[PDB]
Symmetry: D2
Subunit: 288 residues, 4 copies
């Protein structure tokens, strides 16, 4: 009764956010999407035109139920943070209550307290550049949008969450081992995120009895994954399917069912952890 999850970072059905929504929907969790304003209207129109109907089919006995879909920008902590330019920009002008604080307030006002929170977003202006060639501003952009946004989400959402709630984010192994092409300070951002997951786990655990973990996912041909540049993601997938201990296609719903477990009471003694869902690729040193 009333397992409600906010998923921050869905723009289509091709990423981990959607796989997570599907698996949770399967367990009858109510789902609220937080959608970035640059893609929000296109997502809504597609949704309304039934473009996602096939993708919403669970077992053909069940179909996903989505409780709400809200414009959301993890760049802005409160309304006072929004620069006049953004506020007035073509894609933002007609939207409201999309900062982290406002969206938590809106969710609370409409549905009461929630018990599950998903951070499924990242961004970096200079992702295409190697770390050495990343500018101060590009690096800080990657940290701001990909890492600090988690801390802020936690800060504002803990107020609208029940004790024993659970929070997850997504990370990538480039934080711990070198992945050429994962540029722009994304590796730095993921390293910060994994460390912040531990520190937040301490504070949230002690003060709120709330858990936080992160899933280190293997490669998935999402929309963001193309932004990296056959392309970077095509090589990653090919390499993973050839060399992982489990040689099988990694699905967004593989991450989804792990997410679902971490967000449930079944994982109540797990917190502060980086959990690898990557067909075991992370354990390998030397290829065959």
């Amino acid at each position: 009764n009333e397992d409600i999850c906010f998923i921050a970072g869905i723009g289509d059905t091709n990423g981990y956010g959607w796989g997570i929504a599907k698996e949770l929907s399967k367990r009858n969790v109510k789902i609220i999407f937080g959608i970035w304003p640059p893609v929000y209207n296109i997502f809504m129109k597609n949704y309304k035109n039934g473009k996602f109907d096939n993708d919403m089919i669970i077992d053909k006995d069940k179909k996903m139920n989505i409780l709400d879909m809200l414009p959301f920008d993890a760049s802005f902590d409160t309304a006072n943070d929004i620069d006049e330019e953004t506020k007035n920009n073509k894609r933002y002008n007609m939207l409201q209550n999309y900062t982290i604080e406002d969206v938590a307030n809106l969710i609370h006002q409409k549905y009461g307290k929630i018990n599950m929170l998903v951070h499924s977003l990242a961004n970096a202006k200079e992702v295409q550049k190697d770390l050495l060639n990343t500018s101060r501003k590009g690096y800080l952009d990657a940290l701001s949008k990909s890492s600090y946004s988690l801390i802020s989400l936690c800060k504002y959402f803990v107020n609208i969450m029940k004790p024993q709630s659970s929070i997850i984010s997504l990370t990538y192994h480039a934080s711990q081992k070198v992945v050429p092409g994962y540029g722009g300070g994304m590796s730095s951002a993921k390293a910060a995120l994994e460390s912040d997951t531990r520190v937040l786990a301490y504070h949230l655990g002690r003060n709120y009895n709330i858990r936080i973990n992160t899933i280190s996912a293997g490669p998935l041909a999402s929309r963001a994954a193309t932004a990296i540049n056959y392309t970077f993601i095509d090589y990653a997938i090919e390499y993973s399917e050839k060399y992982a201990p489990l040689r099988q296609k990694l699905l967004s719903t593989d991450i989804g069912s792990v997410a679902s477990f971490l967000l449930s009471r079944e994982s109540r003694a797990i917190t502060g952890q980086t959990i690898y869902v990557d067909n075991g690729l992370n354990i390998m040193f030397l290829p065959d």
Copy 2:
């Protein structure tokens, strides 16, 4: 039908039982492997109803135990048992309790299984610090606590379905110093965690079978009381300093095991997963 063999249950106070309870919730059939020295007292307590309250899952269900078999992880095959054991009071009345014999017996009675739990450890010199542990004591720890996992996998893969899943239990003393966790137990756990990776590679590639290990926080089990109030200290420190200040239950480990043993976790393998209320993340007590 799901069937899980759980090697290392002696009573209802350890992690093996909590894992059994949680799997039972999900309608998994459970087979216990019981160390022969305690096999007859276990059967007696069970028959006398000592475990009845511990078997209740809820209003609806009671634990279904498919079978309970003697199992000694010291011995790979029938040929490995020495005379002194053959002659032992608690062994002479039992049979087919080597790792291979148990695999063959389960397969013959019940067919193929799809879940395997290693929940056992031993070290005859656990009360000595590592520096004062003898070669025989150290190798005993590795033999009983680490190699037993490899042997379990070796003999059991033949009786397991593709997409089966295996777990063991470990402890953070492998990675950081726990004074008191002596006799090469820290060594054995480090080997277990590394072996979990290497086995994940061979089992995943050859059989599409997953293997992970759960690094559990402290629980006042029978084996824990043999370390030297060590466990009293560990539990008190964990409950005081862990990010989550709730009592760690065997079923907290059990529900994670159940997930790792299910298809829900089909993309996780070779991993050490911490189920310890977050204690492992702390650097210094606040």
Copy 3:
């Protein structure tokens, strides 16, 4: 002949920068100090008034030789990055060539190419706040000054360094395990720094044959260490001296002699590494 080291982050004789200078000076490496403008004039006056004379004594057979002392602010990559306000500020107005690019240029013009580089600096406006309570701006400040500054230093100094040169920075274990009181995103910054050390090691190793490592140091009662708030550092030191495998006072020159090794040819097969110099405290789980 001509082992020259630039040490970025010395403001007095109480920190790791000074211990590193001493140990290198011991091996006859020439030392150039990069001194932050807020403390630069006070450092120079103290130096000129002989206040550091005792602290410069090596074995009483030898005394430290300092080749140069340059104003340096790791906040600014190039002259074009300096805001008009800073440029005109009381402490900056009378200084020149203190951005990362300008200082590399100046060093090159005066002394030619160098072969050793030390990043011994960190800053975070909100260090006193817990991570959960750190603002976006405070967090980005910590990353900018403590982590990105390393990348930028590398980017500009690789041009004035010889092949087979070596770079080190300093980090702290709070990046990997939770240290309450290490706030403001300093833990996040150190996690980024350790990850960036690997990524830089790849690029610098492959393109320049230059090594980079970081030293994870135990507690030292430096000036910065008081900024954290008996205080945070007093407890850290007390705890380290009581519980480390080696129960002995950790000296800045203990870090210095490790730094010196990492910067020398003796460590030519080590790169991308986080090296712990902390009397072994990091290996402990449970106290006695």
Copy 4:
């Protein structure tokens, strides 16, 4: 005067020799512990001047070797040698080669030492994958490659000065899967790295003695050629993909060992230090 015992030199092509060379540079007196099966061929090659070119440090200096003694890390004390070894062709002509006997002999001839190097490993089933390794094969790997370090420490601390330093060599297969590194060698290295921490605690607190381990990249030593062209592949892959694309030399490991064994590193203990041209940091070949 500094004196270092180096256990595990068989010829001039391994890490033991490179460590000996580098310590010699710093005027450390060197004592070799040589596995009895190869002790007589080593002495013969040495006398015949086979190693003369390898002993040159430079224009100035030649390696000073204080002594060369038979040493078998399989045996803790005289009582541990079985008859079959006593009767063996290559052992019967040698004596005082157990770990305790060597410590006693060195102490009696030369007094206290202050540097100790464990540079040895063995595993009779190295060519089998972990899953197919027998209990006896696995325990042999742990016995010879891991427990030998604990025993070395146990017997040698008595003959060492306070502020002494100990190192061993390990390999990244303990932490990440290297197909080919079989027979429980990966297991033994994981135990070695964990044991390095636990020993650092006991040795640091009780004796103020430091212990670290160097995780080395691949070198075409004698033992390396026994793994199954494995080493040819490892070296080629390392030289192609490591951040530093220079040939890894035994003396690259030797200069790190020398530093860790000196007072320069007085604040480092319980650590695994990677000396591998940075290869360990890479996630996937570019």
